[PDB]
């Protein structure tokens, strides 16, 4: 079957690639998505978060995944929820295939309006990160 | 602020700033979320597109202010949600205050589902912007 199953174990398809997800991801980013998934508990993102930096990364997403493997295929699913919106290419190499878009793990624990206005807010962020990009643009080091 | 009669008279509000939102405004980005608004017919983005580039992105608007006119308050409403995601700043000046949130028409017209995967989208060529502008950042002529 296609991980219908819910056991830890589940795990086995993310963990062979957890060199580049420690070296490539940024937990500080995706924890509170992870909170809406129902996984990720207010103490784990708190212990993670210990450093609200970029500095000890390599170990936030090691312990992270030990993390959110306690809820099972729950937190695995949760991960790739985060995972298909912050960081595509690292689900396109995680699995092998392309974004499937198993979204409804968090449709399911945080609502469809849940979402709606996690979506709806990113791109309210990225709306900004374009002025952001071009006002720094116009002005470089150069 | 807004209303709930069915009329030309509901896009009083927006009327005041008409000839501020076709100059600022193009049809190509909010035209397949008018999609899903219901307000919107496959004949009215064939013939705002029909220039495909911003040479008349003037008359463009000017012309699906008209059409959206047909359905008055369904064509209001619907204006603002759209120009309350991809124009913030639009919507801050034509209704005086901040994006009230009444994305409760696509959510009844489309969904949730159908919001969210508009939103799901929208994040994407935002991705695409953001990275279309951190790739100059990135490297210029100079
Ligand atoms: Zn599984
Ligand atoms: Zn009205």
């Given at each position: 079957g296609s991980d219908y199953e819910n056991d830890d174990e589940c795990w086995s398809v993310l963990e062979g690639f957890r060199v580049t997800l420690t070296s490539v991801i940024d937990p500080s980013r995706i924890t509170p998505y992870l909170r809406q998934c129902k996984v990720l508990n207010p103490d784990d993102e708190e212990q993670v978060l210990s450093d609200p930096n970029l500095v000890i990364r390599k170990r936030k997403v090691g312990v992270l995944l030990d993390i959110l493997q306690r809820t099972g295929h729950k937190g695995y699913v949760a991960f790739l929820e985060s995972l298909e919106l912050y960081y595509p290419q690292l689900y396109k190499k995680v699995t092998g295939?392309?974004?499937?878009?198993?979204?409804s793990m968090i449709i399911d624990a945080s609502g469809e309006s849940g979402l709606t206005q996690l979506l709806m807010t990113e791109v309210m962020k990225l709306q900004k990160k374009v002025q952001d990009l071009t006002a720094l643009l116009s002005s470089k080091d150069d």
């Open positions: 295939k392309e974004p499937a878009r198993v979204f």
